[PDB]
Structures are given as structure tokens and as C-alpha cells.
Design a protein around this ligand. Structure first.
Ligand SMILES: Nc1nc2ncc([C@H](O)[C@@H](O)CO)nc2c(=O)[nH]1
Ligand SMILES: Nc1nc2ncc([C@H](O)[C@@H](O)CO)nc2c(=O)[nH]1
Ligand SMILES: Nc1nc2ncc([C@H](O)[C@@H](O)CO)nc2c(=O)[nH]1
Ligand SMILES: Nc1nc2ncc([C@H](O)[C@@H](O)CO)nc2c(=O)[nH]1
Ligand SMILES: Nc1nc2ncc([C@H](O)[C@@H](O)CO)nc2c(=O)[nH]1
Ligand SMILES: Nc1nc2ncc([C@H](O)[C@@H](O)CO)nc2c(=O)[nH]1
Ligand SMILES: Nc1nc2ncc([C@H](O)[C@@H](O)CO)nc2c(=O)[nH]1
Ligand SMILES: Nc1nc2ncc([C@H](O)[C@@H](O)CO)nc2c(=O)[nH]1
Lengths: 121, 121, 121, 121, 121, 121, 121, 121
């Protein structure tokens, strides 16, 4: 089963992070979310109820990203993957990638972040 | 067998979508199409008949994308994958990715979409 | 006097526009704001009070862009230029550029928009 | 008077050009159009009739670019500037930039093209 | 064994292609080449003789791409993969991706091309 | 006299800024420097002594940007323009643009900054 | 186990390389580092000690890249993978990609480089 | 008279430069050329003889850029401006911008270069 639903480069201004001044100031978080969902039925019926609404998915992601400051990207991604797997039975698996393109690290780079994959069991 | 024929970032203005005002206004759809085709014969003969014409493939994709408004990306991609697998025996598998970089979702992101993979059986 | 203060590519999701379905759905608006301000005093004192706070400027722009739906970019830019010239005596002139990269126009382009320049008299 | 209405990076597939094989094959043309129009009235009334409709402007540009193959970019831009200045009394001046990012010139570059400015008298 | 040597986005002006006017005019070809080579020995000795010289690899690719006009990308990639596998015993496998970002296809896209993978046996 | 020497998009990690947490954490500063220098003599002699060494210019800019934390971009740019005009008699004028692409401002934009122009008298 | 910690497009000015003039002049090296680490515990506790600090990882990478000139990318990547696997028990595997976008190779391309994957045993 | 003919981002591999190791290794040079030419006649006749052939212009630029190593960008641009003004009577003025995006300067930037403007008298 290789079909996916994706939301790519979602950007939220948040205050998450280990460092306190980091929580003070905040930064932009970029989030990719990929859902392993079987799409041939909705592909068959062209009815949205047969698939997972990507619109609703985005509001869920935003709630968490624009929610209470937490320490780790690992934790942020974990709560998004839960929220999504618990809300949508059709989702076999949830992949969550969170990037900080501009964290408090002196140097030159494009970004740093984590990615997790969480089967819905 | 890892050889492919691809068409990347095809852009069409269409009126597909769940929301009606969305069908009214329309938007740009970006489409990626990847075909699992065995290329060493055409690689051997340098004759186009031994491979799948990417030119013809594009007109097929455009017919569908610039065709009658449907509700779901899942459905649009499904009809492209059929059209292609039915027209070309050489295609072992068809992968179809459709992105809406600017759908009616209030927020900041790069795109949302689906991707499907359909073996030609 | 060639010194400026600028805010570039500000992006807001708004519902402005002539077409009603356009007001329904909304879209992303990109805004550039350039202020002709004489900077050598703040350049001398390194005191923020001698210059125009770009932070405050952004909230003003956002209020308008993320405010009540209006018909024209010409009108949106006009209210930003007023707001700014009226709030900040130091601003000799205000330039306001508003772009719709994805308006309801069927075709392929990077953007459409207006730009105005308004002296503070 | 520094206010403008602009349409940026419009892309059309056309067959214009000196070389015949060039007319045969065709290519993508990128067009920028900038109109010197006084916007403070429409800025005042928020009524579209007080300004030049950028939507209508685009169809004019497309008619010409996706029209009969001509030899020179100079000529293509000339007919767009006429069409526009003749259709819209409010336009004081029309600037037309046409780029061929991929003309029949062996080498490595981003583009080649012309730009003209035509007052509406 | 997951180590690779890669050359990415090589660009050559060539005249390859099915259409004759296409052979007449020519275009830019972008080539990606990825070699499955075991790198821990050269990783150990820091001696170039223990690895495949990417410099030499590029001249090989250029010879073919900037060589006699052929009909198909499938064929071009085939001759590069041979040339490379035959010249370098250390290469376990050769992957060759050739893209035409601007072929004679009327429409809007980022590119079309093929990709092949050829084990060195 | 329209000739210039330019250094574009120089990036430095610095701790400048009004906000203290901003001084704590730091950020990337992008700097553009444009020098109005008459180049036809060095254009004539191909001798570097007849022109301003852009290499040396960069070290000057870096000293300041990667120097003691100051409050304002206005002040940072002022010290670069001095340093340069005082060090190089040939420079008729110095233009200094400093951008913060990611300052502590909650929202979506490309950057904020100032630009100054300082004749060497 | 598909979770990763990544650092993407890190850029360092270094003098590594086979050619001596290359060691003389130096160039920019871009480095991607991907760590296969199991993140659900830190995902559970939101405590940094349960995961690998990406900040510390970057300083390690920089030490090596901005360290003594070596001949091969293969060797540079090898020392980064060691350094990391030896320092962090939690890392199951380390992937290191090093690109030279502008090496001493006459031609037009985006980059050349190597990528290695090293399990921590 | 504001009409121009332009060639943008031409890229050549050359060995120009002050430093000798720089002449040894070489680098990519990016060149912009803008010609102030009156285009309304060719705009009138659609005959190429009434305007300056941008194709021929490019070969001239390449001859110089891919010609004998010289010390300064100032000198390179000077010889291009001459060559062009001397060859084409119609050119009122020639603007030449030459950028080194990756010169031997340790640091992080987008480019350094010069720009000159030379009237054809
Ligand atoms: N794996 C992992 N490593 C980290 N290292 C440092 C920080 C801090 O929040 C800051 O120092 C940088 O944002 N966060 C993380 C994190 O969230 N995950
Ligand atoms: N998986 C999936 N989810 C969707 N959610 C909303 C919409 C609607 O057309 C619009 O609200 C957004 O385009 N379409 C889809 C869709 O086509 N697929
Ligand atoms: N100058 C100018 N021309 C316009 N033409 C059409 C529209 C409408 O809102 C829509 O049709 C497109 O967004 N708006 C404008 C506008 O705001 N300004
Ligand atoms: N100023 C100017 N110069 C030109 N040189 C060559 C060509 C031809 O159509 C082709 O050889 C390249 O597209 N066209 C032009 C042109 O349209 N304008
Ligand atoms: N798989 C494959 N399909 C193709 N379709 C058309 C063309 C022609 O050369 C031109 O019409 C387009 O470049 N070439 C190819 C090709 O090389 N490969
Ligand atoms: N003109 C001008 N306005 C500013 N507003 C806020 C800040 C502060 O350092 C921070 O709040 C944002 O970086 N700095 C400036 C500044 O340097 N210049
Ligand atoms: N696999 C591999 N091939 C190479 N070929 C040439 C060079 C030299 O340092 C220079 O000629 C180019 O940077 N280095 C390498 C290298 O580091 N790895
Ligand atoms: N204005 C100007 N300044 C320069 N500074 C250093 C170098 C040298 O060739 C090298 O050190 C850097 O490419 N060239 C120049 C140059 O060509 N122009």
C-alpha cells in the first residue's frame, strides 16, 4: 500500500524549545505531515468521506504547533502523530517532520530537525 | 526493475474540488507522473516505439486535469493512472502525485496533496 | 535623502477582492513596505526612539491586511500608507506594494499587484 | 506620479522568432507588464472602475503572446504596449519586458530579452 | 552497501532527440549520475586511487551528452551507464537520470525525463 | 558616474539588537554593500591598486557584523559605511543594506531591515 | 525503526581536497547529517537527555569540516561518522553526505559529492 | 529613451583573477549585459536588421569571458563594453555586470563583483 496524503512545509510561529530565551523570542517551525492512507476507494467514489480531509488535518497540526511551548521537536511531533492517528481510523501510519531552519545555533545551515513515523494501531 | 519515465511539476489551471466557490474560482494544480517502464530495450535500439512517448503522456494528463471539475484529488489521480495504464501496456506501474499549493486553507504552507501508485494488471 | 526602512514579502491570508467567491475563499497577500526615513541620527545614537520601529510597523500592516475585506489592492495599500504616515512623523514617504501571486485569473504567472508611493505631508 | 499596476512573470507557450525551426518547435515566453497609472482615486473609492482591471490586462497580453508567430520580441512588445495604451486611457505609460529563458543559443544563461517603455499619448 | 558517489544537475547543451527541428535547435540537458561504490576503504586511506574520481566521471558524461545527436534519453543514459561501468570496476551500480526541462512540448511543467539503474556485472 | 563594486548577501551570525533575549540567542544578518567607485582606470590598467579590493572590503564588514553587539541596524550600517569611506579614498559613496530575515517578530515575511547611502566627503 | 535526527545543508569554508591549489584557495562544503535514533522515549518524556542534542552534533561536524585539510570527501565523512557514533550510544546509524557545489571542475553543474551510511556497532 | 536589450546570468568557466591559484583552478563567472538601444523601429518593422542581434552579442561576451586570463573584473567588463560598442552603432550605452559567486574569500555570501556603464561615443 503506497498511497499517501501529504501536507508540506506548513509554517507556524511558535515558542517551543529547550533554551528559555528561545521560548521567549520564538521562531518559525516548518512541518511536513505524510499519511499512509489507502486512497483507491475515495479514488473510486470521489466522495470525501472515503478519505481523510486534509483541511481538518491542518487545523490539528496548527493547534499543536501554535499551542503551549514544549521542550523538544520529538515531543511536538509525537503529539501531532497521536492526535492524528486517534482522530482518523483510516490512517495506517503517520510521518511527522519538524524543522527549525533558524534555531539558536551559531553557524550556516539550512535547517535542523527530527522525523518520526508512527503506525496507527 | 528500477527504470522510470517521469513528468515533473506539470501545472494546469482547473476547477476541481469539494468546495463550490473553489469550483467557481479554480486554481493551479501541479502534477507529477512517474512510470515504471523497462527501458533497456529502447536503450538498446534508440527507437521510440520501444518506450513510452512522454509527449503523448502529457496530453493525457492535461485532458484529465483540464477536464470536468471533480471533487477529489484522489479521483483525479485515479483517472490519470487508469488512462495511462490502459493506453500503454509497457507501463508496469503508474505513480500520480497531485498538489494544491494554494487551496482554500487559511494558513502558511507549501502545498497539500495526495500520491497514489497503481500497478498495470 | 536615500535611506530606507523596509519590510519585505510579508504574507497574510485575507479575503479582499472584487469577486465574491474570492472574498469567500480568500488567498495569500504578499506585502512590501518601504519607508523613506532619515537614519543618520539613529545611526549616530543607536537609540530606537530616533528611528521608526519596524516591529510596530508590521503590526499596523497586519491589522489592515488581516482586516475587513475590501475590494481593491489600491484601497488596501492606501489605508496602510495613511496609517503609517499618520502614526510616524519621521516617515517622509511610504511605498506600498501588494501582490496576489494566485488570484482568480486562469493562466501561468508569478503575480499581479499594484504599488503606490505616498509622501507624508 | 510613481504608482504602478504590474503583472509579473506571465508565461505563454508561443512560436515567435527569427529562426524557422524556432517557429516550428516554439518555446515559453515570460512577460512582465508594468503600467504607470495614478491609483489614489481608486485608492479613495475602492471602486474598480477608477483603476485598470489587471484581469482584463492579462487576457490582452495572452492574445498577443499566444497569437500569430512574429519575428522579434521588439515587435511582440510593441503590439502589447499599443493594445494596452489604446484600450485604457488611464494608463500614462506602458512598460513591456519579454524574456526567452531558453532560446536557440548554445550556452549557459538565465535569459535574454528586451524591455520597452511606451507613453500613452 | 549504501554508499554513493554523485554528480548532480550537470548541464549540457546538446542536439539529441526524436524531432528533427529539435536536433536542429538543440536544448539544455540536465544529468544526474549516482554511483554505488563502497567508500569505506578510501574513507580509511584518504587515497583517491581507492575510490572513483568524480572529476574523470564528469568528462565521460560530457563526452556522451555533448556527443553525436541520438534519438532517445533512454539511449543516452544507456551509453553513459556502460561507459562508466566498463571504465570503473569499483562501481557496483550506475544510476543515470536525464531531464529535459524545456522539450518541444506545449505546456507548463518543470521537466520530463527518464531514469535508469544499471548494475556493473 | 554609474560604476559600482558590490558584495551581495554576506551572512554573519551576530547578537545585535534592541531585545535582550535577541542579544542572548543571536541570529543571521545578511549584508549588501555597494560602492560607487570609478572603475575605468583599473578597467584600463588591469592593476588592482587602481580599484578597491573587494576582498579587503569583506573583512571590514565582517569585523563590524561579527563585532560587539549593538542595538540598531541603523548603527551597524553606519559604522560599516564609515569604516569603508575612511579606509578607501576612491569610494565616492557607500550604500549599506542590512536585513534580518528572522527577527523576533511573530508572523510570515521574507525580511526586515534598513538601507543607507553615505557619500565619502 | 524509521525515526531520524537531521542537520541539513550545513556550510563550512574548508581547504580539503586532492588538488593543492584547491587546498590553497579552499571552498564551501555543504554537509547533510542524518541520524537513525529512536525518538519515541524523548517523544514521551520531552526531556533532551533521552535524545541526541542536535546542537552538540553540529559543533562536532564543524570541528572536522573546519579542521585540518584532508584529501577526500570519503575521508572527511568517515571521521564525522566515527566521531558521532563514538560520542552517542543512542545513534544506531549515521549517514553523512558531503557536497562540493563548486569544485575545480570546468563545466556546469549543481554539485558533486559522496554519501556514506555507518551503523554504530 | 528607456528601451533595452538584455542578456542575464550568462555563466562561463574562466581562469581570470588576481590570485595565481585562482588562475590555476578557475571558477564560474556570471555576466549580465544590458544595452540601451532604441527599439521602436524594429518594433515597427519586425526586421532583425533594425535591432541588435542578442545571439551575436552572446558570442562576443563568451569570447572575452572564455578568453585569456586577466586580473580584474573591471578589465574584463571593460573589454566586453568596448567590443560591443565598437561592433554595434545602434548601442547608445553598454552596462556590464560581472559576478563571482564563489571567489577565494573565506566566508558566507551570495556574490561579489563590479558593474560598469559605458556610453558608445
Ligand atoms: N534531537 C533534538 N536535539 C535538540 N537540541 C537542542 C534543542 C533546543 O531546543 C535548542 O538548543 C535548539 O533549538 N532542541 C532539540 C530538540 O528539540 N531535539
Ligand atoms: N484527502 C483529501 N482531502 C481533501 N480535503 C479538502 C478538499 C477540498 O477540495 C478543499 O477544501 C481543499 O482543496 N479536497 C480534499 C481532496 O481532494 N483530498
Ligand atoms: N488594478 C486592479 N485591478 C484588479 N482587477 C481585478 C481584481 C479582482 O479582485 C479580481 O478579479 C482578481 O483578484 N482586483 C483588482 C485590484 O484590486 N486592482
Ligand atoms: N534584439 C533581438 N535580438 C534577437 N536575436 C535573435 C532572435 C531570434 O529569434 C533567435 O535566434 C533567438 O530567439 N530574436 C531576437 C529578437 O527577437 N530581438
Ligand atoms: N520515453 C521517452 N519519450 C520521449 N518522447 C518524445 C521524445 C522526443 O525527443 C521529443 O518529442 C521531446 O523531446 N523523446 C522521448 C525520449 O527520449 N524518451
Ligand atoms: N528601524 C529599526 N527598527 C527596529 N525595530 C526593532 C528592532 C529590534 O532589534 C527587535 O525587536 C527586532 O530585531 N530593531 C530595529 C532596528 O534595528 N531598526
Ligand atoms: N570520489 C571522489 N572523487 C574525487 N575526485 C577529485 C577530488 C579532488 O579533490 C578534486 O579534483 C575535486 O574537488 N576529490 C574527490 C573526492 O574527494 N572523492
Ligand atoms: N574591485 C575588485 N576587487 C578585487 N579584489 C580581489 C580580486 C581577486 O581576483 C581575488 O582575490 C578574488 O577573486 N579581484 C578583484 C577584482 O577583480 N575587482
Amino acid at each position: 500500500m503506497q498511497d499517501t496524503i501529504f501536507l508540506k512545509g506548513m509554517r507556524f510561529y511558535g515558542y517551543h524549545g529547550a533554551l528559555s530565551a528561545e521560548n521567549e523570542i520564538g521562531q518559525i517551525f516548518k512541518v511536513d505531515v505524510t499519511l499512509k492512507v489507502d486512497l483507491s476507494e475515495a479514488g473510486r467514489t470521489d466522495n470525501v468521506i472515503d478519505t481523510v480531509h486534509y483541511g481538518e488535518v491542518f487545523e490539528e497540526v496548527k493547534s499543536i504547533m501554535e499551542g503551549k511551548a514544549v521542550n523538544l521537536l520529538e515531543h511536538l511531533a509525537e503529539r501531532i502523530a497521536n492526535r492524528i492517528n486517534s482522530q482518523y481510523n483510516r490512517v495506517m501510519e503517520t510521518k511527522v517532520r519538524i524543522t527549525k531552519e533558524n534555531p539558536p545555533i551559531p553557524g550556516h545551515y539550512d535547517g535542523v530537525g527530527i522525523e518520526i513515523v508512527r503506525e496507527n494501531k
